[PDB]
Write an enzyme that holds these catalytic residues in place. Structure first.
Site, mmCIF file in Angstrom:
data_model
loop_
_atom_site.group_PDB
_atom_site.id
_atom_site.type_symbol
_atom_site.label_atom_id
_atom_site.label_comp_id
_atom_site.label_asym_id
_atom_site.label_seq_id
_atom_site.Cartn_x
_atom_site.Cartn_y
_atom_site.Cartn_z
ATOM 1 N N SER A 45 -3.943 -17.836 0.580
ATOM 2 C CA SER A 45 -3.004 -17.963 1.668
ATOM 3 C C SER A 45 -2.472 -19.334 1.969
ATOM 4 C CB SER A 45 -3.626 -17.420 2.980
ATOM 5 O OG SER A 45 -4.113 -16.148 2.559
ATOM 6 N N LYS A 48 1.256 -20.161 1.828
ATOM 7 C CA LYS A 48 2.178 -19.762 2.867
ATOM 8 C C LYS A 48 2.796 -20.914 3.627
ATOM 9 C CE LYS A 48 -0.013 -15.280 2.958
ATOM 10 N NZ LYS A 48 -0.718 -14.243 3.766
ATOM 11 N N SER A 105 -3.226 -13.700 9.386
ATOM 12 C CA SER A 105 -3.309 -13.501 7.917
ATOM 13 C C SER A 105 -2.469 -12.251 7.661
ATOM 14 C CB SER A 105 -4.733 -13.321 7.466
ATOM 15 O OG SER A 105 -5.494 -14.513 7.611
ATOM 16 N N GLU A 141 2.005 -11.010 -2.995
ATOM 17 C CA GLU A 141 0.755 -10.550 -2.352
ATOM 18 C C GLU A 141 0.600 -9.063 -2.651
ATOM 19 O OE1 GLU A 141 -1.457 -12.321 -1.021
ATOM 20 O OE2 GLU A 141 -0.682 -14.058 0.036
ATOM 21 N N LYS A 209 -4.322 -24.278 7.708
ATOM 22 C CA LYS A 209 -4.080 -22.971 7.131
ATOM 23 C C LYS A 209 -5.224 -22.707 6.138
ATOM 24 C CE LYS A 209 -2.599 -18.952 6.136
ATOM 25 N NZ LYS A 209 -2.869 -17.933 7.177
ATOM 26 N N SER A 210 -5.948 -21.620 6.395
ATOM 27 C CA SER A 210 -7.046 -21.303 5.481
ATOM 28 C C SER A 210 -6.624 -20.171 4.550
ATOM 29 C CB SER A 210 -8.277 -20.857 6.274
ATOM 30 O OG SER A 210 -7.982 -19.691 7.009
ATOM 31 N N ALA A 212 -8.503 -17.015 1.663
ATOM 32 C CA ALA A 212 -9.634 -16.454 0.934
ATOM 33 C C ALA A 212 -9.055 -15.424 -0.041
ATOM 34 C CB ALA A 212 -10.654 -15.819 1.859
#
Ligand code: IM2
Length: 263
Positions: A45, A48, A105, A141, A209-210, A212
């Site tokens: 992510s 983004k 998310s 995605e 911004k994380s 996984a």
């Protein structure tokens, strides 16, 4: 500070997988500390933020508008789309999709935004054109999160991502209003609580911004600093670990506590 590298290297050892790290001075671009800075890792992510940077560049060039409305349907929804799943009837604006994509998310939001710029090939061209010849988006995605060992698709390098983020947030790439919009979305991030944010001292600013993905992939990009203003960029990526999400979160949080302690 080398004591933070002690933590970064301990995370690699405890996670049984590669960890990529970089700490950059926002104003000067100086690399203050790094670990595997020029190795590739899946963006997940974190791409983004670059996607909305490409959207904002189009808005600045008059090719797109923040209030433009996009209508989509049930067919378009992919996994992990909690914001977009609720607006099937009247759609969402470009500004609302970037908010969803960065602050929450939401995979469909990112796919809808990707379509507006012409897809992964165009995001990659945008990046190449602003001097980042490393970062690349290849898929949509949710396939871009596959994290296949040794696969260069949908990856970045800690140094490439950190310097690109610096350019997007403070360079002349985006107008001042667009630069601020991107950083405001990141500051409003609602899903990265257990990561750097859990180590942030009172009064400090953070915009992040994380992400996984599959096969243990986990990462975060951030602009943070004392007295309500960002002054450094931190990028942490990892892939290949079999450890639990909590374990991975804790390692990132501890790297964050170390870099904050030695600021
Ligand atoms: C990016 O925001 C991704 C995804 C929507 O593309 C989300 C998924 C998760 S946690 C859910 C899946 N677990 C791991 N495979 C995160 C996160 O940073 O927690 N990013």
């Amino acid at each position: 500070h080398p004591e933070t590298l002690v933590k970064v290297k301990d995370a690699e050892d405890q996670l049984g997988a590669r960890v990529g790290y970089i700490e950059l001075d926002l104003n000067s671009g100086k690399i203050l500390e790094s670990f595997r800075p020029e190795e590739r890792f899946p963006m997940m992510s974190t791409f983004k933020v670059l996607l909305c940077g490409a959207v904002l560049s189009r808005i600045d060039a008059g090719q797109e508008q923040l209030g433009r409305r996009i209508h989509y349907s049930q067919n378009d929804l992919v996994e992990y789309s909690p914001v977009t799943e609720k607006h099937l009837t009247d759609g969402m604006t470009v500004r609302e999709l970037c908010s969803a994509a960065i602050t929450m998310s939401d995979n469909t939001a990112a796919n809808l935004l990707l379509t507006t710029i012409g897809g992964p090939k165009e995001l990659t061209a945008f990046l190449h054109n602003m001097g980042d010849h490393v970062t690349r988006l290849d898929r949509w995605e949710p396939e871009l999160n596959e994290a296949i060992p040794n696969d260069e698709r949908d990856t970045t390098m800690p140094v490439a991502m950190a310097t690109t983020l610096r350019k997007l947030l403070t360079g002349e790439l985006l107008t001042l209003a667009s630069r601020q919009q991107l950083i405001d979305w990141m500051e409003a991030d609602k899903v990265a609580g257990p990561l750097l944010r859990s180590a942030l001292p009172a009064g400090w600013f953070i915009a992040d911004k994380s992400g996984a993905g599959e096969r243990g992939s986990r990462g975060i990009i951030a602009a943070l600093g004392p007295d309500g203003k960002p002054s450094r960029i931190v990028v942490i990526y990892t892939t290949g670990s079999q450890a639990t999400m909590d374990e991975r979160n804790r390692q990132i949080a501890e790297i964050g506590a170390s870099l904050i302690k030695h600021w």
